[PDB]
Design a protein around this nucleic acid. Structure first.
Ligand SMILES: [Mg+2]
Lengths: 70, 52, 99, 118, 778, 44, 122, 75, 101, 103
RNA sequence: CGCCGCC
C-alpha cells in the first residue's frame, strides 16, 4: 500500500478530480507509472522468495504480474 | 469512375517495350531513314558491308 | 619574423619587388574579364586558382614559349584529371602516362 | 557527498506523503491551496511594493557563500556552480543540446513525410 | 488560348508599326521624375554581385528551395521537370559551379529561348502560365532573391508598396482601418468636410510597359549589365501547339524577377499619381523614414488632401479628406467639361446589394458628383500610354453628412466603417466579425469596422470546389476529401471573422460540402440515407475513414426577407443546415481557428513582453530558458518560435517574399490556396489539432469500430496500436519503369477499394432496402 | 488649383479625345468590340 | 600513448552519441557510487586551489588529492577529485576531457574505488 | 535626357559636398577652440534553438492532395 | 583562435596594369605595416601581385573586407598564398649565441 | 547540356527533309538524347536553310548599329528586321563591332 | 415550416 501509494502521485501537484478515484495524469506518465508499478510487484516477489529478478522469462513475469499460482 | 474520360488503353496490349528493344528499333528506323535519304540523293558510293 | 633573403627564397620568379549618394554608372570599359579558363575544360574552384592560375591566360604559344609550355600542358592535364568528367579523366590520364 | 542529502530529502518527503496522506489529493488538499497562494506567477504589479531590491543574503546550500552572478552555462544537471566556473570546456553540453533538438525537429519532419499520401 | 495568342500577336505586331504608344515628352517626364525621387532618397544603386560576395550562397540556397518546392508530387514528366530538378541538385552538389554560371549568364547572354504558355481554367478567369527552360530559371531566381534582398536593404520601396512583410489582414485593417480613424478629426462634418476612398486597379499595367523605357528606368537603380538582362529576358518567343509569336511590348510575368519589375514600375506609377511632394511627405526624410501610414508632425498630415495611400500589387487604395470649399473647386472643375444632370444612377452601390440599403452608399447629388469628380481627377495625371484607371472595375465611396457609412473592399474582403458618433443607439460592436477601432491618442473606441467576404472571393471558392468536383473522376476518395479540406482551410484561416457575417457564403458552404458528400456516394453507387452514414466522412484518417472538416452542420441563420435588404435587423429563425439532426453535433471548423482581432491583440502584448524580457535579461545577466513559453511559444503574428529555428540565418535573406508567392500563379499551375503566408517566416497561423479529438468524442472512441471490420481486422485485440498504410506511396524513383498510358495517368484503384473494404459492414448492411441481394459464387 | 500643381501631367485635356459613342459593327470577329470585351473580361 | 587515451574516452562519447545510447546504460551507470575522478597530465604550475577553480564549474570539489611527491618533488601530474554529486563527475568527464591549460592537454576519467596514492598512469 | 539628368545629379553632388566643407569643418573650429579652457585643462539558451528546420513553405507547392493538417500525430 | 590559415601573405589577382608603384602601397599600407610586394613581369603575372606584411591581423583585415572590392575599374580577388617550396637551402650561417640573451 | 555534334545535325537535316515542320516529337523519336524542344531550337537556330550563316555585309551593319540603338536590348525583336535573324549572329556582330570601335 | 432513397 505504501510505496504504490507514493508512486501514483508522481508530482507534488497531481490532483484528482472529485468524481474520479484514480489520479489524473498524462499517458506518458501513465506508462511511466505502470513501469514502476510492475517493478514494485516484481521486486516484492524477488524479495519474498529470494529469487533473482532478471532470471525470469517473460511468461514467468506475466504469471507473476497477473498473480498466477506458481 | 469516368469511364469516358479516363486515359484509355486496349486489352491484350502487351505494353510499352524496354529500353533495349526501343533503341534497337530506333537503330533500325534510323537505318531505313538514311537508306531512303541516300536513295533520294541517288548516291552511287554508299555501300553496306557483310556486317551492317 | 622573416628576412628578405628567406623571403625571396620563398617566392617564385616572374615577380619583382618595388546617407550616401545616388548618382549613376556609365557604360563601362567592358569589365568582363576571364575568371575560368578559355575552354571547356573543367570548372575551377576558388582554391585551385593558384595551382591552375597559369591557365586563365592564353599562351598563344610563341614569344613566351620554350618547350616549357609543353611541360606545363601537364597543368591542363592535372586540371582535367582532378576536376573533370570521367571521359576527360581517362583521356588526360592515358595521355600523361603515354608521354 | 550530496546525493545522500537528496536521498534523505526524498525519503522524508516520502514519509510525509506515505504515512499520513491518503491516496488521492483533490484540488483543495490544504497544501496545494497553500502553493497557489505562494506562487511567483510573474506579472504582479505589487512585487516591488513589498520587496526592496534583488539583494543577496547568505543564500547557499551550505553556510559557505555561493557563486556570484555571471551566467553559468546550462548543463543538463543543475549544478552547485561555485568557486569560479568561468566557461572553459571542450564544448559538449552545447553539442548534445543541439543534437537532441535536431532529433526533436527531424521527427517533426518525419511525421509530415510519413503521413502524406494517407 | 488560340484566341488570346493571336490577339496578342496582333497587338505585338501593332506595337512595331504604330510606334511606341508613349510620346517622347511623356517618357522624359517619367524619367526625370524618377531621378528626382531617387536623388531625393539618396538611393545608392545596386552593384553587380561579385563572385566573392558574402551573402551569396545564402541566396542561391533560397532560390533552389523556392524552386524545389514545386516538386513534391512525383508523377513528374519525361525530361523537362526531371531535368529541372536535375539542374537543381547539380546546383546543390556544387554551389560555386552554378554560382559562376549565373555570373557568366548574367553578364554575357542576352538572346534567350522559348517560353511556353498555358492557361489555368479558373472558370470566369484565365491566368497565363509561362514555363521557362530551367538553366535560365536558376539564374533569374538567383537574380530576384538578390534584387529583393538588395533593394529592401537599401529601402528602394517606400512603405506603401504592398504586400510588404507584415501580413495581408494587418494590411487590411490594423494598419489600414486603424490608419483611417487615427487621422486628425476624420469625421467632423460640421464644416462640410467629407472623406472619400477610391479603390481601383492600374488597368493593363502588365502589357503597357515598353522595354525601351523599362531598360532606361531600371538602370537608374541596378547595375546596367543586368538591367540589360532584365529587359532582354522580357522578349522571347512565346509558344503553344503551333503558335510561335515573339514578344516585344508587354512583359511576360512568368519570369522569376517579375515581381521586382512590376513593383518598381508601380513605384514610378505611384509617384506619378501622388505627385512628388506628397510622396516625399509620406515616405518621410531618409534619415528617419516613416512607417506604413504614420507621418512626421501632423501639420504635414493636414495639408494636401490625399491622406493615405496603399498600393497592393496593381491595385491602389487612396483616402482623401476634403474640406468643403476644396471639394467645391474640384466638383466645379469636373463640371466645366461635363453637362447633363442626373447622369448618376451608376456610382458604386447601385447593383452591389451585398449590404443593406441603409448600409449602402446613398446617391445624393453632391456626394455622387464628388466621387465621380475625384475619380476624374485621379484618372488623368496618369497618361493613357503607361496605364489607365478604368471607371467600371473601379469603385469610389464617400463619407459626408448625408452618408454615415464609409465602405471599401481591401486585400480580399470588404468592410465598412460606421463611427460611433453617428449611430443613434450604439450598434452592438461586440458580437462577430465586427472588430472595433480605437483612437490610440485617446485610448477610447471610436468606429466600427463591419466585415464581409467579397463577392469575387466566394466566387473563387465556389469555382475552386467546382474544379475539385470536376477532377473527382480522376482521383480517389481520400484525395478529394483531402482537397476539400485544403480548400476549406485556405478559405477559412484567412477569412476568419468575415465568414461569420457573410450569410451568402454560409449558404454556399452547406451547398458545396453536401455536393462532395454526394459525389463520394455516387462513386459507391449508393446515395442512400443510411447506407452511408456521416460517421464515414467525419472520422479522421488516423483511425481510417476520410476525415473532412465540417462547416455545413452550422444552423444557417435567417431574417425577415422583406426587411432584409432594407436594414440591419438582427436575428430570427435559424434554418437547419446539413440534413443531420439526430444529436451528433459534428464540430464546426470555425471554433478551432483563433479569430483575427484576438490574434492581433495577442501579437501586440507578446512582442511587447518579448522585448521587455530581452531588456530584462540584459539588465540582469541571466539566460532566456523557458520564459519564452508563457506566450505558449507560438503567439504573436510572426510567431515567436520563428526567431528560434534552424534557418534563421538564411531566412533573414529571404526578403521580399509574399509578393513572390503571389506571382507564382504565373508559373506552376497549382492554384495556391495559401498565397498569403508560408510557415517558415510567420509561423503556423492555426493549430487545428483538437478538431480530431473533439471529432472522435463527437462520434465515440469506438465510433466506427462498430462499423469498420475491426472484429475481423483480426484478433487485433486492442485497436490502439493500430496503424495504417506507410508503404511507399512516394516511391522515390519507383523502379523507373515504362508506364504505357493508363498506368501513368489513371486513378489508383487500390486505396479506393481498401476504404470500401474497410467500412463493409455499414456500406453493406442487410436491412436498408430488404429486397434483392446477390451472393457471390463460391 | 493650388492643390496639384506639383504633379507632372497637369491635364490630359481629353477623355477619349473626342467622345465615346460608336455602336459600330466590324464583323471581322477578332476585331469586333464584343470579342474585345470578351477577351478582356475573362482572361487576365 | 600518453594522450591517445584522451582520444579513446572521447571516441566513447562520440560513439554513444552516434549509436544513441540512453543514459540508463550510457557507461556512466558503471561508475555510479563514486564521486571521484582521475585527472591526468596537469602542468606542474597547478596548485590545489587553481585546480579547484577550474574544476569547480560543475560543483565544489569536496576532496582533492594531488600527487605531491615525498620530499624531492612538489607535484607529479595527477589529481583525484571528489565532488558533491556523482553527476558532476559525469559532467566533468564529458566536458573537461581533452581541454588544455598552458600547453599540455589534460584528461579526466572516473575512479570507482578510492584515493589510490600512486597506481595510475604517469 | 540621360545626359541632361546625370550632369545635373552630379552637379548637385558637388555643391552638397561643398557645403559639407563649409559646414562641418567650420564647426570643427567651434569644436576645437572650446573657448572655456581650450587645452588648458543576451545569452539565449541552446535548448530554444533548432527545434524546426525547413526553408520550404510547408504548404507544399500548392498541391492540394497530401494531408497537410494536424502538425502532430494522433496516438 | 585561428592556426590553420596561412598569413603574412596575400595573393592578389585581377589587378590593373596602370599600377606604377604607388597604389599597392596605398591599399596595403592602408591596413597596417607592409613587409613588401611582388609585382609580376610576364604579362600574365603583370596584373597579379603578392603582398606580405609584418602583421597577421592586417592580412585578416585585408582578406575579410577587400573580397571583390572594386578599384580602378577591375575588381580584384584576394587569397592567401601557399608557401611550399624554395630554391636554395641556406648554409654556413653562423648565428652563434654571442651573449645576446 | 545540348552539345549538338555533327552526327546528330545531319540526322536532323534528314529528318526534317522527311517528316516536316510542325512535327517534332516524331523526329525527336530517333535521336536518343534530344527532346522535341531542342530539335526546334537547333533547326531554327542553326540548321535552317534560310539562315545566311556567313557573309557579314555593310548595309546590315550600318542598319543594326542604329537599330540596336532604337531598342537597346531585344535581339529577338531586331533579328527579323536585320534578317541575319539567328538572334545571336546579331549579338556576335554587335559585340565584335563594339570591340572594333574600341580596340 | 423537416431535401434526400439509382438501373
Ligand atoms: Mg478504348
Amino acid at each position: 500500500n505504501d510505496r504504490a501509494k507514493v508512486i501514483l502521485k508522481p508530482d507534488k501537484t497531481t490532483i484528482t478530480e472529485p468524481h474520479h478515484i484514480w489520479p489524473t495524469l498524462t499517458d506518458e506518465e501513465w506508462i511511466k507509472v505502470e513501469v514502476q508499478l510492475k517493478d514494485l510487484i516484481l521486486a516484492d516477489y524477488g524479495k519474498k522468495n529470494n529469487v533473482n529478478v532478471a532470471s525470469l522469462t517473460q511468461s514467468e513475469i506475466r504469471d507473476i504480474i497477473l498473480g498466477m499460482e506458481i | 469512375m469516368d469511364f469516358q474520360h479516363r486515359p484509355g488503353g486496349k486489352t491484350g496490349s502487351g505494353g510499352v517495350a524496354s529500353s533495349s528493344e526501343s533503341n534497337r528499333d530506333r537503330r533500325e528506323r534510323l537505318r531505313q531513314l538514311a537508306l531512303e535519304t541516300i536513295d533520294i540523293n541517288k548516291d552511287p558510293y554508299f555501300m553496306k558491308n557483310h556486317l551492317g | 619574423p622573416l628576412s628578405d633573403e628567406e623571403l625571396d627564397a620563398m617566392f617564385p620568379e616572374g615577380y619583382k619587388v618595388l546617407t550616401g549618394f545616388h548618382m549613376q554608372t556609365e557604360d563601362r570599359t567592358m569589365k568582363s574579364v576571364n575568371d575560368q579558363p578559355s575552354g571547356n575544360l573543367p570548372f575551377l574552384k576558388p582554391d585551385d586558382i593558384q595551382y591552375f592560375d597559369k591557365l586563365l591566360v592564353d599562351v598563344d604559344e610563341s614569344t613566351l614559349s620554350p618547350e616549357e609550355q609543353k611541360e606545363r600542358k601537364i597543368m591542363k592535364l592535372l586540371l582535367k584529371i582532378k576536376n573533370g568528367t570521367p571521359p576527360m579523366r581517362k583521356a588526360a590520364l592515358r595521355q600523361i602516362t603515354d608521354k | 557527498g550530496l546525493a545522500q542529502s537528496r536521498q534523505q530529502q526524498q525519503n522524508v518527503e516520502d514519509a510525509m506523503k506515505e504515512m499520513q496522506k491518503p491516496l488521492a489529493r483533490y484540488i483543495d488538499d490544504e497544501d496545494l491551496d497553500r502553493m497557489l497562494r505562494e506562487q511567483e506567477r510573474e506579472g504582479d504589479p505589487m512585487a516591488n511594493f513589498i520587496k526592496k531590491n534583488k539583494a543577496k543574503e547568505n543564500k547557499n546550500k551550505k553556510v559557505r557563500p555561493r557563486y556570484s552572478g555571471p551566467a553559468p552555462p546550462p548543463n543538463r544537471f543543475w549544478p552547485g556552480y561555485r568557486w569560479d566556473g568561468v566557461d572553459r570546456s571542450n564544448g559538449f553540453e552545447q553539442k548534445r543540446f543541439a543534437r537532441l533538438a535536431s532529433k526533436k525537429a527531424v521527427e517533426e519532419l518525419a511525421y509530415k513525410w510519413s503521413v502524406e499520401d494517407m | 488560348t488560340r484566341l488570346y495568342l493571336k490577339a496578342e500577336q496582333e497587338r505585338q505586331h501593332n506595337y512595331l508599326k504604330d510606334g511606341p504608344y508613349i510620346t517622347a515628352e511623356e517618357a522624359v517626364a517619367v524619367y526625370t521624375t524618377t531621378v528626382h525621387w531617387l536623388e531625393s532618397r539618396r538611393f545608392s544603386p545596386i552593384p553587380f554581385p561579385p563572385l566573392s560576395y558574402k551573402h551569396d550562397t545564402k541566396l542561391l540556397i533560397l532560390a533552389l528551395e523556392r524552386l524545389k518546392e514545386a516538386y513534391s508530387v512525383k508523377s513528374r514528366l519525361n525530361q523537362s521537370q526531371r531535368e529541372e530538378l536535375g539542374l537543381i541538385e547539380q546546383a546543390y552538389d556544387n554551389p560555386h559551379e552554378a554560382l559562376s554560371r549565373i555570373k557568366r549568364h548574367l553578364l554575357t547572354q542576352r538572346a534567350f529561348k522559348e517560353v511556353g504558355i498555358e492557361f489555368m481554367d479558373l472558370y470566369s478567369h484565365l491566368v497565363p502560365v509561362y514555363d521557362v527552360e530551367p538553366l535560365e530559371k536558376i539564374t533569374d531566381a538567383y537574380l530576384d532573391q538578390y534584387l529583393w534582398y538588395e533593394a529592401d536593404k537599401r529601402r528602394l520601396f517606400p512603405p506603401w508598396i504592398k504586400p510588404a512583410d507584415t501580413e495581408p489582414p494587418p494590411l487590411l485593417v490594423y494598419k489600414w482601418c486603424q490608419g483611417i480613424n487615427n487621422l486628425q478629426d476624420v469625421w467632423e462634418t460640421s464644416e462640410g468636410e467629407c472623406n472619400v476612398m477610391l479603390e481601383s486597379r492600374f488597368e493593363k499595367m502588365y502589357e503597357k510597359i515598353d522595354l525601351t523605357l523599362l531598360n532606361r528606368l531600371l538602370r537608374l537603380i541596378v547595375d546596367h549589365n543586368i538591367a540589360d538582362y532584365m529587359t532582354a529576358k522580357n522578349n522571347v518567343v512565346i509558344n503553344y501547339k503551333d503558335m510561335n509569336h515573339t514578344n516585344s511590348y508587354g512583359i511576360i510575368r512568368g519570369l522569376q524577377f517579375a515581381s521586382f519589375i512590376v513593383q518598381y514600375y508601380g513605384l514610378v506609377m505611384d509617384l506619378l499619381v501622388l505627385g512628388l511632394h506628397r510622396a516625399s511627405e509620406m515616405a518621410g526624410p531618409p534619415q528617419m523614414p516613416n512607417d506604413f501610414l504614420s507621418f512626421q508632425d501632423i501639420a504635414t498630415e493636414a495639408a494636401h488632401p490625399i491622406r493615405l495611400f496603399c498600393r497592393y500589387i496593381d491595385r491602389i487604395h487612396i483616402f482623401f479628406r476634403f474640406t468643403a470649399d476644396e471639394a467645391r473647386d474640384l466638383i466645379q472643375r469636373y463640371l466645366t467639361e461635363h453637362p447633363d444632370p442626373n447622369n448618376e444612377n451608376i456610382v458604386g452601390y447601385n447593383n452591389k446589394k451585398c449590404w443593406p440599403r441603409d448600409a449602402r452608399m446613398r446617391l445624393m447629388k453632391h456626394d455622387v458628383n464628388l466621387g465621380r469628380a475625384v475619380f476624374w481627377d485621379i484618372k488623368n495625371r496618369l497618361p493613357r500610354s503607361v496605364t489607365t484607371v478604368q471607371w467600371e472595375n473601379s469603385f469610389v465611396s464617400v463619407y459626408s453628412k448625408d452618408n454615415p457609412n464609409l465602405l471599401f473592399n481591401m486585400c480580399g474582403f470588404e468592410c465598412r466603417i460606421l463611427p460611433k458618433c453617428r449611430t443613434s443607439y450604439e450598434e452592438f460592436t461586440h458580437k462577430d466579425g465586427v472588430w472595433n477601432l480605437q483612437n490610440e491618442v485617446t485610448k477610447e473606441r471610436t468606429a466600427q469596422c463591419f466585415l464581409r467576404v467579397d463577392d469575387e472571393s466566394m466566387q473563387r471558392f465556389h469555382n475552386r470546389v467546382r474544379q475539385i468536383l470536376m477532377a473527382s473522376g480522376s482521383t480517389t476518395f481520400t484525395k478529394i476529401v483531402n482537397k476539400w479540406n485544403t480548400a476549406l482551410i485556405g478559405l477559412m484561416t484567412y477569412f476568419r471573422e468575415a465568414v461569420v457575417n457573410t450569410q451568402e457564403l454560409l449558404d454556399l458552404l452547406v451547398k458545396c460540402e453536401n455536393k462532395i458528400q454526394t459525389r463520394i456516394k455516387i462513386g459507391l453507387n449508393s446515395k442512400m440515407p443510411s447506407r452511408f452514414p456521416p460517421v464515414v466522412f467525419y472520422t479522421p484518417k488516423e483511425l481510417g475513414g476520410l476525415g473532412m472538416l465540417s462547416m455545413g452542420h452550422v444552423l444557417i441563420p435567417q431574417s425577415d426577407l422583406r426587411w432584409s435588404k432594407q436594414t440591419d435587423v438582427g436575428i430570427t429563425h435559424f434554418r437547419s443546415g446539413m440534413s443531420h439532426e439526430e444529436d451528433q453535433l459534428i464540430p464546426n471548423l470555425y471554433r478551432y481557428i483563433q479569430p483575427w482581432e484576438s490574434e492581433f491583440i495577442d501579437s501586440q502584448r507578446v512582442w511587447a513582453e518579448y522585448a521587455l524580457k530581452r531588456q530584462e535579461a540584459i539588465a540582469q545577466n541571466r539566460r532566456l530558458t523557458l520564459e519564452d513559453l508563457e506566450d505558449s511559444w507560438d503567439r504573436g503574428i510572426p510567431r515567436i518560435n520563428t526567431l528560434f529555428q534552424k534557418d534563421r540565418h538564411t531566412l533573414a535573406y529571404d526578403k521580399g517574399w509574399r509578393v513572390r508567392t503571389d506571382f507564382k500563379q504565373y508559373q506552376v499551375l497549382k492554384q495556391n490556396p495559401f498565397w498569403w503566408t508560408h510557415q517558415r517566416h510567420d509561423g503556423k497561423l492555426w493549430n487545428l489539432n483538437n478538431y480530431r479529438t473533439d471529432m472522435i468524442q463527437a462520434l465515440g472512441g469506438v465510433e466506427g469500430i462498430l462499423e469498420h471490420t475491426l472484429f475481423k481486422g483480426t484478433y487485433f485485440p486492442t485497436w490502439e496500436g493500430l496503424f495504417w498504410e506507410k508503404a511507399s506511396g512516394f516511391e522515390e524513383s519507383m523502379k523507373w519503369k515504362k508506364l504505357t498510358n493508363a498506368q501513368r495517368s489513371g486513378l489508383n484503384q487500390i486505396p479506393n477499394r481498401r476504404f470500401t473494404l474497410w467500412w463493409s459492414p455499414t456500406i453493406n448492411r442487410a436491412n436498408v432496402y430488404v429486397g434483392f441481394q446477390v451472393q457471390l459464387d463460391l | 488649383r493650388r492643390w496639384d500643381d506639383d504633379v507632372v501631367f497637369k491635364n490630359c485635356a481629353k477623355g477619349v479625345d473626342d467622345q465615346k459613342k460608336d455602336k459600330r459593327f466590324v464583323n471581322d470577329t477578332l476585331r469586333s468590340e464584343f470579342h474585345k470585351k470578351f477577351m478582356e473580361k475573362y482572361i487576365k | 600513448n600518453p594522450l591517445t587515451k584522451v582520444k579513446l574516452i572521447n571516441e566513447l562519447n562520440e560513439r554513444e552519441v552516434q549509436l544513441g545510447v540512453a543514459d540508463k546504460v550510457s557507461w556512466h551507470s558503471e561508475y555510479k557510487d563514486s564521486a571521484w575522478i582521475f585527472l591526468g597530465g596537469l602542468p606542474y604550475e597547478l596548485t590545489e586551489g587553481d585546480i579547484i577553480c577550474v574544476f569547480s564549474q560543475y560543483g565544489e570539489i569536496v576532496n582533492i588529492n594531488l600527487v605531491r611527491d615525498k620530499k624531492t618533488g612538489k607535484s607529479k601530474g595527477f589529481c583525484f577529485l571528489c565532488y558533491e554529486d556523482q553527476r558532476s563527475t559525469i559532467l566533468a568527464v564529458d566536458n573537461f576531457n581533452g581541454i588544455k591549460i598552458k600547453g599540455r592537454t589534460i584528461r579526466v576519467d572516473h575512479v570507482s574505488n578510492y584515493r589510490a596514492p600512486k597506481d595510475s598512469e604517469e | 535626357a540621360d545626359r541632361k539628368a546625370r550632369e545635373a545629379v552630379e552637379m548637385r553632388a558637388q555643391v552638397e559636398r561643398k557645403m559639407a566643407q563649409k559646414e562641418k569643418e567650420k564647426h570643427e573650429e567651434k569644436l576645437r577652440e572650446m573657448a572655456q579652457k581650450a587645452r588648458e585643462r543576451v545569452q539565449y539558451d541552446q535548448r530554444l534553438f533548432n527545434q524546426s528546420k525547413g526553408m520550404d513553405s510547408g504548404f507544399a507547392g500548392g498541391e492540394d492532395e497530401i494531408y497537410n493538417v494536424y502538425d502532430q500525430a494522433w496516438r | 583562435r585561428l592556426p590553420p590559415e596561412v598569413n603574412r601573405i596575400l595573393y592578389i589577382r585581377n589587378l590593373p596594369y596602370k599600377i606604377t608603384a604607388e597604389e599597392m602601397y596605398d591599399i596595403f599600407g592602408k591596413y597596417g605595416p607592409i613587409r613588401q610586394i611582388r609585382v609580376g613581369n610576364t604579362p600574365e603575372t603583370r596584373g597579379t601581385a603578392y603582398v606580405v606584411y609584418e602583421d597577421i591581423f592586417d592580412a585578416k583585415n585585408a582578406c575579410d573586407h577587400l573580397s571583390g572590392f572594386n578599384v580602378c575599374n577591375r575588381y580584384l580577388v584576394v587569397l592567401y598564398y601557399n608557401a611550399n617550396r624554395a630554391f636554395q637551402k641556406m648554409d654556413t650561417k653562423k648565428k652563434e649565441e654571442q651573449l645576446k640573451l | 547540356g545540348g552539345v549538338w555534334r555533327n552526327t546528330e545535325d545531319e540526322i536532323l537535316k534528314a529528318a526534317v527533309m522527311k517528316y516536316g515542320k510542325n512535327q517534332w516529337s516524331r523526329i525527336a523519336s530517333l535521336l536518343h538524347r534530344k527532346s522535341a524542344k531542342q530539335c526546334k531550337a537547333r533547326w531554327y537556330e542553326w540548321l535552317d536553310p534560310s539562315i545566311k550563316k556567313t557573309e557579314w555585309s555593310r548595309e546590315e551593319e550600318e542598319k543594326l548599329l542604329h537599330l540596336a540603338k532604337l531598342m537597346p536590348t531585344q535581339w529577338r525583336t531586331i533579328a527579323p528586321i536585320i534578317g541575319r535573324t539567328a538572334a545571336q549572329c546579331l549579338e556576335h556582330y554587335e559585340f565584335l563591332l563594339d570591340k572594333a570601335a574600341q580596340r
